[PDB]
């Protein structure tokens, strides 16, 4: 029965790992979108600042 | 200050950076055409110090006690200005950064703070005795700190544990509440006469301070106050 | 081995003191020359 | 934030004498020398790259609160640069929050305390 | 053996998730780094043209 405890534990732990992996990639995907947008805004704001100081 | 001294009232006179007074004298002499003496200092250094420090004295009618601050260029005590300043000193108080940063507000280092009054023929036999028993356990600056550092206290130090406890207790006990800082730290200031100091430290060195943990000698006026805090 | 190492260290320490004392003496004389130059110049 | 910095750096300077010679020091002294080295490598700033007050506060809070202990010494400067890129890009709001309430008597309020430890934890988990 | 395999698979899945997570942000960032250089370049050329108008 302890082996049976190991069998369900082994299956459940992997299921948690795949579930955690989905959350990890989802967090990375949301970070990737946020970082891309923020860099765009910072670059656009910096570009406008260059124009204003040039003027 | 001399006006009030002539009025008979005791006066405490503070001179901040008397070394700057010496430096001003040196610059005045250099601009006046006098030849320099020693390291560019004025030839009339001793006399200029005498004409000022000799007015700080205790006559029969009144006294002017002085508590000056001395800045030594670099760390050179051989410099003529600190030497001439020290020739007119009766006591030195060495405030220390480490004691100040350990939350003990009066940072007067128990060591490196000497006085020529600390002899039996003026303060008294008991005062000298108690002031010698203290600063003796600290005479090493608790040199035991290094052996603790490299030995883990060796799990046992016998008497050294008692002397370390007593030294820490005294170091904590040197602190005293400030009546001027009462409105800042929210604690009434206690004025401790010299008799209370000597009696309290005599009892602490005898051992009445034992069986009482630290943080109870941190910020109090008398040993009686420490006992009252302990019983409460 | 410790006795040999300490003896070598003490010999090196004593040699360093002699070297430092030799260097300190040069600095002592140069300090005097500097002072005897400023005071003589300040006299004139 | 900088009081602990100054105290730890001073004690590391004091213990450098043992660090230079002794190799039998306990784990406490070894970890404390390691922390001193962490702080010293943190202070190694390049030229023409000033750090605003919020950035320095964030980095020093991260370092003095043991979040940097597992980072090896040679990579601490790169860690700081990456962390600043993280805050400048991923979480500008934490920088704005730190700079907004840098004058309050008790700076480490749970509000500023959260969303900053969270940012440090996210950065630690994502990289290395 | 089951417990050892469970820990090995749990660590491998999480490490695999983090490795691809690092890949996502790495490619997302470099997309922004090349784009911000383009944004700066457009403003830099625009600033020079405005300088010519001053001339």
Could you please describe the fold and organization of this structure?
This is part of a larger assembly, with two copies of chain A (55 residues), one copy of chain B (232 residues), one copy of chain C (44 residues) and one copy of chain D (128 residues). Chain A has 55 residues and is mainly alpha-helical. In chain A, 96% of the residues lie in helices and 0% in strands. Chain A is built from one helix and no strands. The longest helix of chain A has 53 residues, at 2-54. Chain A is rod-shaped, with a radius of gyration of 24 Å. A two-stranded parallel sheet of chain B has the order 1-2. Chain B has helices at 2-6, 18-32, 45-53, 80-86, 97-101, 125-133, 144-151, 159-173, 182-185, 194-206, 223-231; strands at residues 11-13, 64-66. In chain B, helix 6 (125-133) crosses helix 10 (194-206). Chain B has 232 residues and is an all-alpha fold. The N and C termini of chain B lie far apart (46 Å). In chain B, 43% of the residues lie in helices and 3% in strands. Chain D has helices at 2-21, 27-42, 53-64, 76-89, 92-100, 110-113, 117-126. The relative contact order of chain D is 0.12. Chains in contact: A-D, A-E, B-C, B-D, D-E. Chain D binds chain E through residues 125-127, and chain E through 18, 21-22, 25. Chains A, E: It is found in: Cell membrane.
Which structural traits does this protein have?
5 chains, A: 0% strand, D: 128 residues, mainly alpha, 66% helix, ATP synthase subunit beta (chain B), ATP synthase subunit alpha (chain D), ATP synthase gamma chain (chain C)
Topology:
This is part of a larger assembly, with 2 copies of chain A (55 residues), 1 copy of chain B (232 residues), 1 copy of chain C (44 residues) and 1 copy of chain D (128 residues).
Chain A: H1 2-54
Chain B: H1 2-6, E1 11-13, H2 18-32, H3 45-53, E2 64-66, H4 80-86, H5 97-101, H6 125-133, H7 144-151, H8 159-173, H9 182-185, H10 194-206, H11 223-231
Parallel strand pairs in B: 1-2
Chain C: H1 2-43
GO molecular function (chains A, E): proton-transporting ATP synthase activity, rotational mechanism
Keywords (chains A, E): ATP synthesis, Cell membrane, CF(0), Hydrogen ion transport, Ion transport, Membrane, Transmembrane, Transmembrane helix, Transport
Organism (chains A, E): Chloroflexus aurantiacus (strain ATCC 29366 / DSM 635 / J-10-fl)
Largest sheet: spatial strand order of chain B: 1-2
Q: How many β-strand stretches of chain B?
A: 2
Number of helical segments of chain D?
A: 7
Q: Whole-number radius of gyration of chain D?
A: 15 Å
Protein chain pair with the most extensive contact, residues per chain: A-E, 34 and 32 residues
Largest sheet of chain D: none
DSSP helical segment count of chain B:
11
Which structural class do you get from the secondary structure elements of chain B? mainly alpha
SSE arrangement of chain D, N to C: HHHHHHH
The tally of strands of chain D reads: 0
